Structures are given as structure tokens and as C-alpha cells.
Amino acid sequence: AMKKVQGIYRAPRQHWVGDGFPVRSMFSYQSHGKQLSPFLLLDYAGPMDFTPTTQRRGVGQHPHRGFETVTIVYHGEVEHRDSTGNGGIIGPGDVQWMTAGAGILHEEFHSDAFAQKGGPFEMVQLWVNLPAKDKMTAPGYQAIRREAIPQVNLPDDAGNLRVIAGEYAGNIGPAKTFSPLNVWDIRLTQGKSCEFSLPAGWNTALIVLHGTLLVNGDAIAREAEMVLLDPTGTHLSIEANNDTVLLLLSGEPIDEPIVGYGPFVMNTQAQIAEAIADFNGGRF
Ligand SMILES: [Cu+2]
Numbered sequence: 365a366m367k368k369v370q371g372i373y374r375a376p377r378q379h380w381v382g383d384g385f386p387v388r389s390m391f392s393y394q395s396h397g398k399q400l401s402p403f404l405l406l407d408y409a410g411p412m413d414f415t416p417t418t419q420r421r422g423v424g425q426h427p428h429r430g431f432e433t434v435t436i437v438y439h440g441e442v443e444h445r446d447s448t449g450n451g452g453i454i455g456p457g458d459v460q461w462m463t464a465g466a467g468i469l470h471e472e473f474h475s476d477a478f479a480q481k482g483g484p485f486e487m488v489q490l491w492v493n494l495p496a497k498d499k500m501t502a503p504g505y506q507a508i509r510r511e512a513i514p515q516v517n518l519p520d521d522a523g524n525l526r527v528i529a530g531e532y533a534g535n536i537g538p539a540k541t542f543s544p545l546n547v548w549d550i551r552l553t554q555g556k557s558c559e560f561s562l563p564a565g566w567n568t569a570l571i572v573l574h575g576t577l578l579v580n581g582d583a584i585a586r587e588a589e590m591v592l593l594d595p596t597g598t599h600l601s602i603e604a605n606n607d608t609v610l611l612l613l614s615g616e617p618i619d620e621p622i623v624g625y626g627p628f629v630m631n632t633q634a635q636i637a638e639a640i641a642d643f644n645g646g647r648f
Contacts, residue, residue, distance in 0.1 A: 365597040366580055367568050370399070375408065375588040382423030384442075384474050385409045387489065390571060390590045393622050393629070399567055399592060401617045402543050404431060404629055405491035406571060408588060411439065414474070416482040422473025427648045428464035429639045430499045430629045432492040434539075435460045436528065436549065436611070438573075440485035441475035447648065450505035453477075457510030459528055461539045465494065465501040467639070467648050488571070488611065490547070496620050496631050498542045512538045513549075522556035523604070525549070530614070545615030550602075552577070552610070557603035560612070568593040568600070568614040575608030 375388040387407035391400055414421070422442075435442060441455045446462060447469040454460050455475075462470065474485070494501065514527045514535040527537035530546030539547065544563075552558065552575070562568055570579065570591040577585045580601055585591045593600065595617065602610075621631050628639040642648065 366599045366601075367562060367593040367595065367597040369579055369583040370592045370594050372583055372585050373590040373592065375590075381407070382421070383419070384421035384472070385423060385487075385489070386412050388588060390588070391569065391592075393624055396592060397622050398617070399595065400569060401567055401619075401622070402493045402545055402615045403490060403567070403569065403613050404493050404622070404624070405489075406590075406613075407489040408571070408573065409489065410484065410486040412485050414440075414478070414482050414485050417479055420473050420479060423471060425469050425471040426627055427467060427469050427643050428627050429467045430635075431464055431494050432542075433462045433464065434490040434492060434547070435472070436488040436490070438486040438488075440483065440487065441478040442487065443473050443475045444470065444505075446470035446503070446505060448503050448505060450507070452507050454507070455510075457513070459508040459513065459539065461506040461508060463501060463504040465499065465503045467642065468503040469648050488573075490613075491629070492541070492545070493618055493622070493629060494542050495618050499630060501542070506539060508538050518552070518556075518558050520556065521553065522558045523550065523552040543616055543618060546612065548612040550608075550610050550612055552602060552604040552608045554604050554607045557601060560600045560602070561598055562600060562614050563616070564598050565595050565617070566614045567595045567617050568612070570602070571611040571613065573609040573611070575610075576605040577608050577610060578603040578605060
């Protein structure tokens, strides 16, 4: 049985996060959050050309608690800093997987090298929820180099698939996760198609960044659109009408309440109140 297309959703207008991240919120837990779990949020940054500058564009220090954030860089360079003492530069093809867990402070800025030169900036920021038992896990950070992400050639010269998290055709992705999920970066060649088998009951979304995609033979998704699938079923087909770049997100639902406010995502309102009080009290 196919994972039926539930709907196609166009990106909203762009908004700024800080002065470094012009993003479109392609989905968020406030709408269809149960049908997207474990994924809470996806902000698509760019694509935008930045001017050479002496300024350090980015987003200043702020807290998170209760979930993980994933940065997938396509163009440009970001420098990461967080309160566990982790740092580093994420460039094209690199990924960072940050666990906020019990609580973290972080900031993200254009790298000095990217500041000096300018050019295209394109990135996806993904929030991944944690199961309740793991929400106060210790904060941590995975820097994932492009070279560590398997690139799998699709059959029939159809393109390639980068396994960031999860497993495709026996290729395991380097990102460690708290619940079972896939994050696949797919380049599908115009006129080519591919069939995917996904676990039964997993929530699944396709995020089209570039190109035009025919899904299940009957739904068309274009640049900066989200295809939300029905979790029931196991089979999905995609066909590229033009060379397409997409993210496939799929995961076992976390069947626990979502209570989110600002930078915090917990299971209850009292836990949100505790996060605000801890942050205000200097505990982060
Ligand atoms: Cu943040």
C-alpha cells in the first residue's frame, strides 16, 4: 500500500532569524504536529546571496530545552558555538546534530570566511523532538562532515541519496538519534524515478528545495513546497520533472503530548514554566 499524499503545502513568506538566517518555516508543530512527529520544525534558509561584510551576521545566544536541532548546509558556512563547549564550522554538505536535552545555550553565525567573501547561503534547520524519557538527557553535539555521510547511487542512474540519519538499502547514516527516523538528502535526475519502501505507520514528509517532483504519480510539488504523506502504508514513488533536490523525512511517531513555547518544547505546560524559570534564574 502507498503512503497516500495528504496534502501539498507551499512555503510561507520569509522571515528573519537574527541577521544571518532568512528562513521560510515549511512546517511547524502548531499545525499537523502529530502527523509530523518526531519532526517539530523545518526552517529553509535562503537561497540568498550575502554581500561581503565586516559584520558577523547570525543569531545571538539563546536557549533550548527538550529536543534536538539539525543544521544541513547546502551553500555558505556557519560557525556554531554552544554552552557544552562545542564549536566548529559547518560548510557545504556538512551537518550538525545538536541535542538540547536538559538545556543548552547556542549561537550560530556566518563564518569569518563566508563573511569576507559573500555569496550564496542555503541551509535547512530541522527541530527533532525527543521522547519524554529523553527530554532531560545531557546536551551534546555531533559535527558530521560531508565525507562521513553515505552517498548511495539510485538504481537506473536515477540520481543519488545521502543518508544523514537512518538507513537506506543497508547504508546506515552517521547521525545518532533517540527514536527511529530517516533523514535523506535526495538528488533525483530529470526524467528519472525511484520507488521507496518506508516502515508502516511512520510519519513521512518530502521537502522539495529545487525542481519539480511528481509523487505517487499524481501529486506535483515544486520548489519550496512540502508534501505531507499519510503514515499508513509503506510505499512511495517519486519522479523528477526537472532535476530535483529534496529532503525525505520519515519517522516513528512519538505518541506523547507536544507543548511548545518559543525555544522550548516539552510535554506539559508546567514543564514549559519550569524551563522559563530555569532560564530566567541563570540555570542554563
Ligand atoms: Cu536555537
